[PDB]
């Protein structure tokens, strides 16, 4: 239930100085944090969709859950990424 450790590690490496190192257990920690992030947002969206008797978690439900939970700054880059992904 985790994203591939090499992808997580590549994103981490791009964030720190080129000379820095990342311990294996820190890559594994971030791997777990990512999965919890996805589950945390999904839980918020899924409760809302249930309250509204809707059977599909849509993109707006994920974005709204992110906005509610402190990640409103993600909404605009995600919309742009999705639009560009589909164009």
């Amino acid at each position: 239930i985790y994203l591939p450790i090499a992808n997580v590690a590549r994103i981490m490496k791009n964030a720190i100085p080129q000379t820095g190192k990342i311990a294996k257990d820190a890559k594994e920690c971030v791997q777990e944090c990512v999965s919890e992030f996805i589950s945390f947002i999904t839980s918020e969206a899924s409760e809302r969709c249930h309250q509204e008797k809707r059977k599909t978690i849509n993109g707006e439900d994920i974005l709204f859950a992110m906005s509610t939970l402190g990640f409103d700054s993600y909404v605009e880059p995600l919309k742009l990424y999705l639009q560009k992904f589909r164009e």
Partner: protein
């Protein structure tokens, strides 16, 4: 790193662990792939503050634990990094 490389099937599998998730739209995993890249990058940068504050150049799990305590947006990781 290109966000398109993240496996959408794995993101969907994680979402599907939720007890109230029935169907998921096609776009939801795509949005989470980009969100994952933003989240990892910000968390790593915030942990690296503590790496350097401790006069180290290796990012360690304790640095991530400290970063989580210093940003409200990471409050939800309280049990993941104890």
């Amino acid at each position: 790193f290109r966000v398109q490389e993240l496996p959408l099937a794995r993101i969907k599998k994680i979402m599907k662990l939720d007890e109230d998730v029935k169907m998921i739209s096609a776009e939801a995993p795509v949005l989470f792939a980009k969100a994952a890249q933003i989240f990892i990058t910000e968390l790593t940068l915030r942990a690296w503050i503590h790496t350097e504050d401790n006069k180290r150049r290796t990012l360690q799990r304790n640095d991530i634990a400290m970063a989580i305590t210093k940003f409200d947006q990471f409050d939800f990781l309280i049990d993941i990094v104890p």
